């Protein structure tokens, strides 16, 4: 039996990325998504027809709200639906945007920003292993954490808890054998809406070959944390962000 | 006139000793409190008996909800109505439990222990700088953050979200000529509930005088992060833990 | 042709491990070595019975002196005489034991705490780059911000070696040189340790509750070299069963 | 009866700034310094015309080789010989200049950076507790340890084995009652040989004022550590950097 992970924001980008490889090395695989569908079935597809009945798709809102804990609850739900176990979970979906201290309501604002980038994860984490070899669990986290973005405070509050989660989670989960690590990417995938010319200032700052990390580079840091190469490994966090964290103002 | 300053949760333990000292000090005072009213009231008693019209107390509950953005608004404005002003903000307030990953239901201990520990504080920060010379906020974290306490991950969750917290508001209001600033107790005031015999294993543990931290030692890291002899210091986070956060395993 | 290596301290324990990986990855392998000629011989004419003239041993003494620069230079030197390329480097040797506060004298600790951890690093790192999937990887160690009591050289030696990292990393983007560290908690404990006083550093390990072997180190350092890393510099990973998260 | 302080490098500007400070508030001082004779001897005269007998020099060579001990142990002995006790060290003094890694030897490079940076503070500091109240010592540090300037390498690991020392001094001395600190400017005065264009480059990049800390500043910070408002804190560094280790490249 081949084992199985759940991906969350797997339809684009760098979840996406994460989901492909994982399958690529034979992992089963939930797509989970939120707004697009097209792309995530479209993916789905795709890794179908490559290996009969090895990807799913799972939609879900993971903004805090009452209900959070049973999306969560359901989304593990799927892979073992599916799939009959669960052995890697990669908490990668998140809302991202400036929350100026001095359009969406503030208590909107708390919920997506710190619903989905640490209190699902928190969810999850719990879901996961109340619901259980080689089981890990990595959180995608930002290599720029310490030295933020402008005007980005509830992005980068609930980006630090997810390294208090990162952290707390690695040392309650390993009497139960269960890992957690992260992977910080520096400037990866540039925002869809974003002008060539901003996008080219970014890569400029990036001592490593004046570049922003593909998809895939992100994909194979996630993909040793979960490998055997890894096992002894809990409560890391790799940074993969060509040396930008390094760069002063 | 005197500067004024809101304390929250100012009540009892460590945040009655930082109402005392910046009273002390000159300040006129907000106390602040949820369940405590006889104690805040007592307190305020006690600095006006010293200096007539120079204590005033706030009730709020800073649980996480659809109406904590307007009890942020009104506490800062509570200080505007007595005092004219608001020099100083200090975030004092915490609930801390554990939250075992493997009673109050989960959607609630989400709502007190990161609303209290985390968004209250973003909140109260949005509301100080929007009503804006010696001008600073100082966040009360934990020196522990990175050496968490079993089953307390959405505490440190929550204490982490502050650290992130009080460095993009450092960032993002530093142009204002507003300071953002920590103080990280290590073991101070030992939870009231804890047994004598656990008390005593965790004071054994310090380094410095194998003791915990008086509540006035950890308000004197406040007094002076607030002072004009940290007029420089922005984005910092001073440890008062005796050297415990240096001890291994 | 087969990339080439430079793994320092690589007679036995951590290094030896690592070199082994290496040259089961396909790596030729320059194993030095200080005082363990025989141990470093013995991997050497094993190494070669894989695949002949693929491993050769250099030895050098890496405590600080006025001829370390020297020293330094010949060990990656040796790498291109021998195989005519150096693609790697690995910073493994060390001096460790305690130096208290309050019969070697403080400027022979000095020497070789310092040397061995930071200054010979600094030195092999000058020489590699100079010379030129290019990259350096120092051992590290994960208890930096914790550490033993009495061990203050050896603690001021490993941060000296995080800070090399994180410069090295800085300066060397530009010539394609990739530089990050591995840092082990506690893995392959003393030789001399007693099993009880061993077993109270393994109670402390949250994973497994046991120490990691060179092999799992060694599959950090593997990683960090491939092409799956291509990106990664200045970071440190840990390998550590999550020992560093672990209050007093 | 008045204690007695050792600053190294107390001629010019940071170092000078501490040493009035320290005597200011009370302490007897001595001025170590190894080139500037007439400044060290002009602020001794200046604080001995102030107070009577507070003041004195010491001239001494901190850079690496088998007799920096013996001149770290010398500095020790000279606050008891002139002053019968010493309660205050502060290190201070820093060689500071590039050295890239693709007319002084590499080996003198090596001896002065590390030596003066990092070598002579653990030598001073073995000398101090072994001739032993508020007794501590205070590191000056380096907030941008982390985003370290182009080919300085040397001198950055200089730094970060102070942070290292900082740490294990602390943890060590602790139940000798000695406290360790540190004080982490980012920019304050500039250097000399820098030109003016060069200079402004840098003062731009603060968040807090757009300008470079004053040595009073710094100075600040080392008070308030070794005063009895800081006797729970050992092992902690306080950064006074304006923000500028916050700002992102
Ligand atoms: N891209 C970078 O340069 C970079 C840099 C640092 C860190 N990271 C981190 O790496 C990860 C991946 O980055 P990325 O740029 O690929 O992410 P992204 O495109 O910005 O977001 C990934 C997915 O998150 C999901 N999402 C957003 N709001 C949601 C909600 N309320 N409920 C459920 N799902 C929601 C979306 O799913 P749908 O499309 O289905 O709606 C989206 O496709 C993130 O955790 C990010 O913070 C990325
Ligand atoms: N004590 C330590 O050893 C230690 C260690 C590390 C960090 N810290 C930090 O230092 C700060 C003070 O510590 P402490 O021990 O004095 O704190 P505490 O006694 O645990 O809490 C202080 C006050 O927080 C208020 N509070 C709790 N839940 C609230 C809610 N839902 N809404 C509004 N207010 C609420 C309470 O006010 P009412 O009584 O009026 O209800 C309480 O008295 C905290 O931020 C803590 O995390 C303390
Ligand atoms: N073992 C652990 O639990 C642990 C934990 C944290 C970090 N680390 C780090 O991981 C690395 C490997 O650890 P380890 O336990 O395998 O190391 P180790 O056995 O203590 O020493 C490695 C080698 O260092 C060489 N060495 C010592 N002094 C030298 C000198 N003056 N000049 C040149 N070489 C010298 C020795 O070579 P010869 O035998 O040829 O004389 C020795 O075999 C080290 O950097 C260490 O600090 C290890
Ligand atoms: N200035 C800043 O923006 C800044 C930023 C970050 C950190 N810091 C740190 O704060 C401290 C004070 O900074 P600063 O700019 O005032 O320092 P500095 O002027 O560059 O150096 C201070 C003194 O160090 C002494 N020194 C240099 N080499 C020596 C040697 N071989 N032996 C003995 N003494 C030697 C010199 O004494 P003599 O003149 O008598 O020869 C010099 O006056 C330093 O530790 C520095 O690294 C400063
Ligand atoms: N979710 C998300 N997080 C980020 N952090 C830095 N850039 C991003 C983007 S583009 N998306
Ligand atoms: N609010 C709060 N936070 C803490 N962190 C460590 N101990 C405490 C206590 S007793 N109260
Ligand atoms: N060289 C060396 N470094 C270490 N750090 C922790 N343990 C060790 C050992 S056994 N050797
Ligand atoms: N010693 C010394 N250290 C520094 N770090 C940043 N600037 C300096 C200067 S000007 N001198």
Not at 187 to 198: N, R
Not at 222 to 240: C, D, N, P
Request: glycine letters at 6%; aromatic letters at 6%; hydrophobic letters at 45%.
């Amino acid at each position: 039996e081949a084992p199985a992970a759940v991906v969350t924001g797997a339809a684009k980008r760098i979840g996406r990325a994460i989901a492909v490889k994982l399958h690529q090395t034979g992992y089963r695989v939930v797509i989970h998504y939120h707004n697009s569908a097209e792309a995530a079935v479209s993916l789905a597809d795709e890794l179908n027809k490559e290996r009969s009945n090895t990807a799913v798709v799972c939609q879900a809102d993971l903004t805090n709200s009452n209900v959070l804990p049973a999306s969560c609850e359901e989304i593990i739900n799927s892979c073992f639906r599916a799939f009959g176990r669960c052995d890697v979970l990669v908490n990668n979906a998140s809302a991202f945007y400036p929350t100026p201290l001095v359009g969406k309501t503030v208590e909107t604002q708390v919920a997506e920003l710190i619903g989905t980038n640490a209190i699902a994860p928190f969810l999850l984490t719990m879901s996961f292993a109340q619901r259980q070899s080689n089981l890990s669990i990595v959180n995608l986290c930002d290599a720029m954490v310490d030295q933020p973005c402008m005007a980005f405070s509830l992005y980068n509050m609930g980006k630090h808890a997810l390294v208090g989660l990162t952290q707390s989670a690695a040392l309650e989960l390993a009497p139960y054998g269960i890992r957690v690590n992260g992977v910080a990417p520096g400037v990866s995938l540039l925002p869809v809406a974003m002008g060539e010319e901003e996008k080219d200032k970014w890569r400029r700052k990036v001592p490593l070959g004046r570049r922003e990390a593909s998809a895939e580079q992100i994909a194979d840091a996630v993909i040793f944390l979960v490998s055997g190469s890894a096992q002894y490994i809990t409560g890391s966090i790799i940074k993969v962000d060509g040396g930008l964290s390094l760069v002063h103002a």
